[PDB]
From Swiss-Prot, chains A, B:
Protein name: Bifunctional D-Ala-D-Ala dipeptidase and D-Ala-D-Ala carboxypeptidase VanXYC
Source organism of this protein record: Enterococcus gallinarum
Catalytic residues in the record: 153
Record: residues binding a dipeptide: 67, 88, 93, 95, 102, 155-156
EC number, UniProt record: 3.4.13.22, 3.4.17.-
MF (Gene Ontology): carboxypeptidase activity; metal ion binding
Binding site for Cu(2+): 95, 102, 156
Chief subcellular location: cytoplasm
Subcellular location: Cytoplasm
Positions of Mg(2+) binding: 66
Catalytic reaction annotation: D-alanyl-D-alanine + H2O = 2 D-alanine; UDP-N-acetyl-alpha-D-muramoyl-L-alanyl-gamma-D-glutamyl-L-lysyl-D-alanyl-D-alanine + H2O = UDP-N-acetyl-alpha-D-muramoyl-L-alanyl-gamma-D-glutamyl-L-lysyl-D-alanine + D-alanine
Name of the gene: vanXYC
Consequence recorded when altering residue 153 to A: Abolishes hydrolysis of D-Ala-D-Ala and UDP-MurNAc-L-Ala-D-Glu-L-Lys-D-Ala-D-Ala
Length: 189, 189
């Protein structure tokens, strides 16, 4: 399990990649599964911020088959433009390795299915101040769509572990930029 | 693809069972997957009852691995006796074939993922008057625990299709009893 694995349209998962170990994650009203270290840190984060009553886990692990059904549904209902913006191609979603969480607001209702609401909120603001201290980064920041190939998603967080999440967050980097940085650095040696 | 397949502790899924066709199902606050005919009928039922803003799909298709992790989670959090009452053994859950739905109310926060709240509500009462007309039965009725081996679950519905759901519901039967009836009736010929 490499917590730093880069998964995107240019770096799809391999077909022979071993499914992640999984556990059911707490703090949701439905069954959501994550890699065990991810679930542990999610739980630690929610408890430490006192956000139990204000936020909830919306999505976690999803198989390739499921990612394809999600892509196909969004294509049919919302069209290609929206779908390309907010839904990773099957085989190219970090949800498939159990390292990604989609988080939503609790008193929030009438949610978008693909884009849960996690904006304009004191709870979200507190979450954004602490999540990096528990190994999470905001995966798809607002002005990075050319780098990530995905639109702004304030609800989507990727587990990379410490100190990576703190380094990435402090520099306002994407995971793509973090990989570029590590590659540029090793060569110096 | 028998919509009548009996899956329980005494009749676990085959190891050689075809995994089901799947589509994303509407009327949830997260991604849920079901066999296509079940999703279609679920949607028709919610629209017919006008419950789009009142009820939600809590759970649908669950892989065997996920059922194991759900079972393991409940053991840890709720203990063995409670887990055996409300969670099917891994390999013995109709959720694994995409023909079962767990239904809850939309305006609930901190709902229980094991036992979603689905009683004492106008929406639930209306759902209970119409679901049999769209192919669904209440899988685990009260006072059938000795027959089904599972405690009463007002939130859990099984798709069997028409007219079976109407026949089962009118007789206040379980799917177990329906199977015994079909077998006994075949013998009369
Ligand atoms: Cl697992
Ligand atoms: Cl699957
Ligand atoms: Cl996605
Ligand atoms: Cl039986
Ligand atoms: Cl399919
Ligand atoms: Cl179950
Ligand atoms: Zn996501
Ligand atoms: Zn269920």
């Amino acid at each position: 399990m490499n917590t730093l694995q880069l998964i995107n349209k240019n770096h799809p998962l391999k077909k022979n990649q071993e499914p992640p170990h999984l556990v059911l994650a707490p703090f949701s009203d439905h069954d959501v599964y994550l890699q065990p270290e991810v679930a542990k840190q999610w739980e630690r984060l929610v408890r430490a911020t006192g956000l139990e009553k204000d936020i909830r886990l919306v999505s976690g692990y999803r198989t390739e088959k499921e990612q394809r059904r999600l892509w196909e549904y969004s294509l049919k209902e919302n069209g290609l433009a929206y779908t390309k913006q907010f839904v990773a191609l099957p085989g190219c979603s970090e949800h498939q390795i159990g390292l990604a969480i989609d988080v939503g607001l609790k008193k929030q209702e009438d949610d978008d299915l693909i884009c849960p609401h996690f904006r304009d909120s004191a709870a979200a603001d507190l979450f954004m101040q602490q999540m990096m201290n528990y190994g999470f980064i905001l995966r798809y920041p607002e002005d990075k769509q050319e780098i990530t190939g995905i639109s702004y998603e304030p609800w989507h967080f990727r587990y990379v572990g410490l100190p990576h999440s703190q380094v990435i967050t402090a520099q306002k980097w994407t995971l793509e930029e973090y990989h570029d940085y590590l590659a540029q650095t090793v060569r110096q040696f």
